[PDB]
Amino acid sequence: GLPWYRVHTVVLNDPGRLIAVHLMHTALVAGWAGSMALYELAVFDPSDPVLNPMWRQGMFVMPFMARIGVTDSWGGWSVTGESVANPGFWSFEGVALAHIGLSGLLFLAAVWHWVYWDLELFRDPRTGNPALDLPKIFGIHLLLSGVLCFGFGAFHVTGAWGPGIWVSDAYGITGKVQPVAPAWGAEGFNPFNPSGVASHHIAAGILGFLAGIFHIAVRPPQRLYRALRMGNIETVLSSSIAAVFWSAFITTGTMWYGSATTPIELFGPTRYQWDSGYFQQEIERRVENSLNEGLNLSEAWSRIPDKLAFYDYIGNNPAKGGLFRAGPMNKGDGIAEAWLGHPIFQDKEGKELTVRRMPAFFETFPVILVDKDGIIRADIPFRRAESKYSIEQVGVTVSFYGGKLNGQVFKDAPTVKKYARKAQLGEVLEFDRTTLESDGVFRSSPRGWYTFGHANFALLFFLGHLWHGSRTLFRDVFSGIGAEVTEQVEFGAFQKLGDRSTK
Amino acid sequence: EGTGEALGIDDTRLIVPVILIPVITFILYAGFASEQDNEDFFDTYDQRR
Amino acid sequence: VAGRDIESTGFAWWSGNSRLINVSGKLLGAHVAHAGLMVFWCGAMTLFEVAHYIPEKPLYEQGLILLPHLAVLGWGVGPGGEIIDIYPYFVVGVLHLISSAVLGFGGVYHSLIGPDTLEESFPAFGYDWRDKNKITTILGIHLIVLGIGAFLLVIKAMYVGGIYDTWAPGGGDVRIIDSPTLNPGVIFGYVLKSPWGGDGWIVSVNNMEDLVGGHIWIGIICIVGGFWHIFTKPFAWARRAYVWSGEAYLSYSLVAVSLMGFIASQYSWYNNTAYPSEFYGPTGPEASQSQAFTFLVRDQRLGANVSSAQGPTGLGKYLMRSPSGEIILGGETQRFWDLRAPWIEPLRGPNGLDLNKIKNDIQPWQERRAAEYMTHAPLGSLNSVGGVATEINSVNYVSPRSWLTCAHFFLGFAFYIGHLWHAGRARAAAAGFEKGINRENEPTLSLRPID
Amino acid sequence: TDLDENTRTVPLDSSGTTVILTPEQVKRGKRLFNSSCGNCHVGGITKTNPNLGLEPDALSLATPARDNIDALVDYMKNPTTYDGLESIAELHPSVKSADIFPKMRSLSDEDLFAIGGHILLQPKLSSEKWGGGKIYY
Amino acid sequence: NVEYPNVPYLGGSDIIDVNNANVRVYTRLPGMYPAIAKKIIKRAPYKDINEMLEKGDFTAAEKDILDKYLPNLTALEPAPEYVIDNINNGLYR
Amino acid sequence: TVQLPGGERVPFLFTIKELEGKFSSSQVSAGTELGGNFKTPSYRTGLFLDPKGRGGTTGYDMAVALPGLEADGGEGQDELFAETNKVFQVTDGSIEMAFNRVDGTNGEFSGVFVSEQLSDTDMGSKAPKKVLLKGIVFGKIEEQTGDEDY
Ligand code: CLA
Ligand code: CLA
Ligand code: CLA
Ligand code: CLA
Ligand code: CLA
Ligand code: CLA
Ligand code: CLA
Ligand code: CLA
Ligand SMILES: CC1=CCCC(C)(C)[C@H]1/C=C/C(C)=C/C=C/C(C)=C/C=C/C=C(C)/C=C/C=C(C)/C=C/C1=C(C)CCCC1(C)C
Ligand SMILES: CC1=CCCC(C)(C)[C@H]1/C=C/C(C)=C/C=C/C(C)=C/C=C/C=C(C)/C=C/C=C(C)/C=C/C1=C(C)CCCC1(C)C
Ligand SMILES: CC1=CCCC(C)(C)[C@H]1/C=C/C(C)=C/C=C/C(C)=C/C=C/C=C(C)/C=C/C=C(C)/C=C\C1=C(C)CCCC1(C)C
User: In whole angstroms, how large is the CA radius of gyration of chain A?
Assistant: 30
Asked if A238 and A248 count as a contact pair (C-beta separation under 8 A), the reply is no
- Contact check, Cβ <8 Å, A364/F64: yes
Asked if A385 and F57 count as a contact pair (C-beta separation under 8 A), the reply is yes
Can you tell me whether residue A178 is helix, strand or coil? strand
β-partners of residue A399 are A344, A409
Nearest ligand 1 atom, CA A251: 62
End-to-end CA distance of chain B: 46
β-pairing, E16-17 vs E73-74, is: parallel
- Residue A8, annotated ligand binder? yes
Backbone phi and psi for residue D123, each to the nearest 5 degrees, phi listed first: -60, -30
Instruction: List residues of chain F with CB under 8 Å from any CB of chain A.
Output: 53, 57-74, 76
- Contact check, Cβ <8 Å, C304/E88: yes
Asked if A122 and A15 count as a contact pair (C-beta separation under 8 A), the reply is yes
Chains B and F touch (3+ CB pairs under 8 A): no
SS3 sequence of D93-114: CCHHHCCCCCCCCCCCHHHHHH
Kindly tell me the burial class for residue E26, based on how many C-beta atoms sit within 10 Å of its own C-beta (0-12, 13-18, 19 or more): buried
Nearest ligand 5 atom, CA C25: 57
CA angle C273, C274, C277 (to 5 degrees): 55
β-partners of residue C174 are C164
Q: Cis peptide before C400, with omega less than 30 degrees from 0?
A: no
Q: Flag whether residue A421 sits within 8 Å of chain F, measured between CB atoms.
A: yes
Neighbours of F57 (CB within 10 A): 27
Neighbours of A452 (CB within 10 A): 17
Ligand 6 close to Cβ of residue C256 (< 6 A): no
Question: d(Cα C431, Cα C80) in Å, to the nearest integer?
Answer: 60
Q: Using CA positions, which residue lies closest to atom 2 of ligand 8?
A: C254
β-pairing, A176-178 vs E73-74, is: unpaired
Of the candidates A66, A93, A60, A97, the residue with the CA atom closest to the CA atom of residue A81: A66
CA angle C205, C206, C207 (to 5 degrees): 100
Question: d(Cα D66, Cα D50) in Å, to the nearest integer?
Answer: 17
Q: Flag whether residue C386 sits within 8 Å of chain D, measured between CB atoms.
A: yes
Residue A199 alpha carbon to ligand 1 centre in Å: 12
**Amino acid sitting at position E46:** Y
Question: d(Cα A153, Cα A143) in Å, to the nearest integer?
Answer: 15
Contacts with C388 (C-beta within 8 Å, 6 or more apart), sequence order: C379
Question: d(Cα D58, Cα D82) in Å, to the nearest integer?
Answer: 9
C-alpha separations of A429 from A314, A401, A405 in Å: 11, 13, 10
Backbone phi and psi for residue A89, each to the nearest 5 degrees, phi listed first: -65, -45
Ligand 1 close to Cβ of residue A457 (< 6 A): no
Question: d(Cα F88, Cα A463) in Å, to the nearest integer?
Answer: 61
Chain B residues close to C198, C-beta within 8 Å: 1-4
How far is E13 from chain A, CA to nearest CA, in Å?
6
Instruction: Compare all CA atoms of chain D with the CA of E29 and give the residue at the minimum distance.
Output: D61
Question: d(Cα A34, Cα A28) in Å, to the nearest integer?
Answer: 10
Question: d(Cα A238, Cα D43) in Å, to the nearest integer?
Answer: 63
DSSP chain D: ----HHHHEEE-SSSS-EEE--HHHHHHHHHHHHHHTHHHHGGG--SS-TTS-SSHHHHHTSSS---SHHHHHHHTTS-B-TTSSSB-TTTS--GGGTTTSTTSSS--HHHHHHHHHHHHHHHHH-SS-TTTGGGG-
Ligand 1 close to Cβ of residue A80 (< 6 A): no
Chain C residues close to E84, C-beta within 8 Å: 310
Chain A residues close to F70, C-beta within 8 Å: 421-422, 425, 440
Backbone phi and psi for residue F75, each to the nearest 5 degrees, phi listed first: -110, -35
Question: d(Cα A168, Cα C9) in Å, to the nearest integer?
Answer: 88
Residue C221 alpha carbon to ligand 6 centre in Å: 11
Instruction: Compare all CA atoms of chain E with the CA of F91 and give the residue at the minimum distance.
Output: E80
SS3 sequence of C270-321: HCCCCCCHHHHCCCHHHHHHHHHHHHHHHHHHCCCCHHHCECCCCCECCEEE
Asked if C89 and C75 count as a contact pair (C-beta separation under 8 A), the reply is yes
Given a contact as 3+ CB pairs under 8 Å, which chains touch E?
A: A, C, D, F
Question: d(Cα C129, Cα A122) in Å, to the nearest integer?
Answer: 83
DSSP A385-432: TT-SSBHHHH-EEEEEESSTTTT-EE-SHHHHHHHHHHHTTBS-EEEE
DSSP C39: H
β-partners of residue A354 are A370
Residue C63 alpha carbon to ligand 1 centre in Å: 67
Instruction: Compare all CA atoms of chain E with the CA of D137 and give the residue at the minimum distance.
Output: E93
Contacts with D41 (C-beta within 8 Å, 6 or more apart), sequence order: D33, D47, D54
Residue A26 alpha carbon to ligand 9 centre in Å: 10
Contacts with A376 (C-beta within 8 Å, 6 or more apart), sequence order: A368, A369, A370, A389
DSSP C66-102: SHHHHHHHTSSB-GGG-B---HHHHHHHHHHHHHHHH
Which helix (H) or strand (E) segment holds residue C226: the answer is helix C208-230
β-partners of residue F109 are F102, F139
Helices C208-230 and C132-158: angle between axes, nearest 10 degrees: 150
DSSP C232-248: ----HHHHTSS--SHHH
Given a contact as 3+ CB pairs under 8 Å, which chains touch C?
A: B, D, E, F
End-to-end CA distance of chain F: 31
How far is F147 from chain C, CA to nearest CA, in Å?
9
Q: Using CA positions, which residue lies closest to atom 5 of ligand 3?
A: A237
Question: d(Cα A406, Cα A414) in Å, to the nearest integer?
Answer: 19
DSSP C98-145: HHHHHHHHHHHHHHHTS-S-TTTT-TTT---TT-HHHHHHHHHHHHHH
Asked if A422 and A32 count as a contact pair (C-beta separation under 8 A), the reply is no
End-to-end CA distance of chain A: 42
- Residue A113, annotated ligand binder? yes
Question: d(Cα C171, Cα C165) in Å, to the nearest integer?
Answer: 9
Question: d(Cα A144, Cα A86) in Å, to the nearest integer?
Answer: 35
Q: Using CA positions, which residue lies closest to atom 38 of ligand 3?
A: A5
**Amino acid sitting at position D119:** I
β-partners of residue C175 are C163
SS3 sequence of A269-317: CCHHHHHCCHHHHHHHHHHHHHHHCCCCHHHHHHCCCHHHHHHCEHHHC
β-pairing, C163-165 vs C319-321, is: unpaired
* Resolution at which this structure was determined, Å: 2.5
Can you tell me whether residue E69 is helix, strand or coil? coil
Asked if E13 and A394 count as a contact pair (C-beta separation under 8 A), the reply is no
Contacts with A62 (C-beta within 8 Å, 6 or more apart), sequence order: A37, A40, A41, A44, A54, A79, A92
Chain E residues close to C302, C-beta within 8 Å: 23, 34, 37-38, 41, 87
Nearest ligand 7 atom, CA C268: 62
Of the candidates A406, A431, A410, the residue with the CA atom closest to the CA atom of residue A341: A406
β-partners of residue C165 are C173
Asked if A234 and A468 count as a contact pair (C-beta separation under 8 A), the reply is yes
Q: Using CA positions, which residue lies closest to atom 8 of ligand 9?
A: A453
Of the candidates C327, F89, F18, D50, the residue with the CA atom closest to the CA atom of residue E89: D50
Can you tell me whether residue A500 is helix, strand or coil? coil
Asked if F57 and F134 count as a contact pair (C-beta separation under 8 A), the reply is no
Chain D residues close to C294, C-beta within 8 Å: 48
Of the candidates A41, A24, A132, the residue with the CA atom closest to the CA atom of residue A93: A41
Ligand 9 close to Cβ of residue A32 (< 6 A): yes
Question: d(Cα D111, Cα D118) in Å, to the nearest integer?
Answer: 11
Chain-centre distance of CA A112, in angstroms?
36
Instruction: Compare all CA atoms of chain D with the CA of C392 and give the residue at the minimum distance.
Output: D137
Helices (H), chain F: 67-71, 81-84
Kindly tell me the burial class for residue A79, based on how many C-beta atoms sit within 10 Å of its own C-beta (0-12, 13-18, 19 or more): buried
CA angle A364, A365, A371 (to 5 degrees): 165
DSSP A82: P
Of the candidates A389, E17, E3, E12, the residue with the CA atom closest to the CA atom of residue F57: E3
Strands (E), A144-284: 165-167, 176-178
Can you tell me whether residue A91 is helix, strand or coil? coil
Helices A233-257 and A134-151: angle between axes, nearest 10 degrees: 30
Question: d(Cα F71, Cα F79) in Å, to the nearest integer?
Answer: 14
F76 backbone φψ class: left, alpha, beta (φ>0; ψ -120 to 50): left
Q: Give the C:E interface size as CB pairs under 8 Å.
A: 22
Contacts with A51 (C-beta within 8 Å, 6 or more apart), sequence order: A306, A307, A310, A335, A336, A337, A338, A339, A429
Asked if C32 and C106 count as a contact pair (C-beta separation under 8 A), the reply is yes
Which helix (H) or strand (E) segment holds residue A352: the answer is strand A352-355
DSSP A14-72: -HHHHHHHHHHHHHHHHHHHHHHHHHHHHH---S-TTTS-TGGGT-SSHHHHHHTT--B
- Contact check, Cβ <8 Å, F46/E2: no
Of the candidates A122, A91, A195, A118, the residue with the CA atom closest to the CA atom of residue A153: A195
How far is E25 from chain A, CA to nearest CA, in Å?
8
DSSP F72: B
Neighbours of F75 (CB within 10 A): 13
How far is E69 from chain D, CA to nearest CA, in Å?
13
Can you tell me whether residue F41 is helix, strand or coil? coil
Which helix (H) or strand (E) segment holds residue C6: the answer is helix C6-9
Query: How many residues are listed for chain D in this entry?
Result: 137
Strands (E), chain F: 2-3, 9-10, 20-23, 33-40, 91-102, 108-118, 130-140
Asked if C136 and C233 count as a contact pair (C-beta separation under 8 A), the reply is yes
Can you tell me whether residue E20 is helix, strand or coil? coil
CA angle C304, F86, E37 (to 5 degrees): 25
Contacts with C22 (C-beta within 8 Å, 6 or more apart), sequence order: C117, C129, C246
Question: d(Cα A429, Cα A338) in Å, to the nearest integer?
Answer: 6
Residue C429 alpha carbon to ligand 11 centre in Å: 27
Interface list for E 7-46 with D (CB within 8 A): 23-24, 27-36
Chain A residues close to E7, C-beta within 8 Å: 381, 384, 387, 390, 392-393
- Contact check, Cβ <8 Å, A386/E4: no
Q: For F84, which of E2, E84, E89 is closest by C-beta distance?
A: E2
- Contact check, Cβ <8 Å, F46/E81: yes
Question: d(Cα A253, Cα C431) in Å, to the nearest integer?
Answer: 68
Question: d(Cα A400, Cα A342) in Å, to the nearest integer?
Answer: 6
Question: d(Cα C388, Cα C297) in Å, to the nearest integer?
Answer: 23
β-partners of residue F117 are F131
β-partners of residue F139 are F109
Asked if D119 and D112 count as a contact pair (C-beta separation under 8 A), the reply is no
Q: Flag whether residue C355 sits within 8 Å of chain E, measured between CB atoms.
A: no
Contacts with F48 (C-beta within 8 Å, 6 or more apart), sequence order: C312, C313, F55, F56, F86, F123
Ligand 5 close to Cβ of residue C122 (< 6 A): yes
Residue C32 alpha carbon to ligand 10 centre in Å: 12
